[PDB]
Symmetry: C3
Subunit: 33 residues, 3 copies
């Protein structure tokens, strides 16, 4: 259970980092995004 939760949490960290990059690109208009 705990190890599986560690994996789901890391997966969420990956998804959140991607969202952060995409949101910063939209907020700042980077490269015309």
């Amino acid at each position: 259970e705990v190890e599986a939760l560690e994996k789901k949490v890391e997966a969420l960290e990956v998804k959140v980092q991607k969202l952060e990059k995409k949101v910063e690109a939209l907020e700042h208009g980077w490269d015309g995004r």
Copy 2:
């Protein structure tokens, strides 16, 4: 503790999926968003 963490992690998955949909809509301009 562990079961409560499982619930919080699932709640985060729900919030992250919603954010992903909203961000993709903004990035692609779907339906004028």
Copy 3:
């Protein structure tokens, strides 16, 4: 392990709340964002 996971989950909640605010601002154009 479990307490460390509790901390990572709270950190994710903070990041997700920030993303939600930023996305709502972009979706609604708040304050010209």
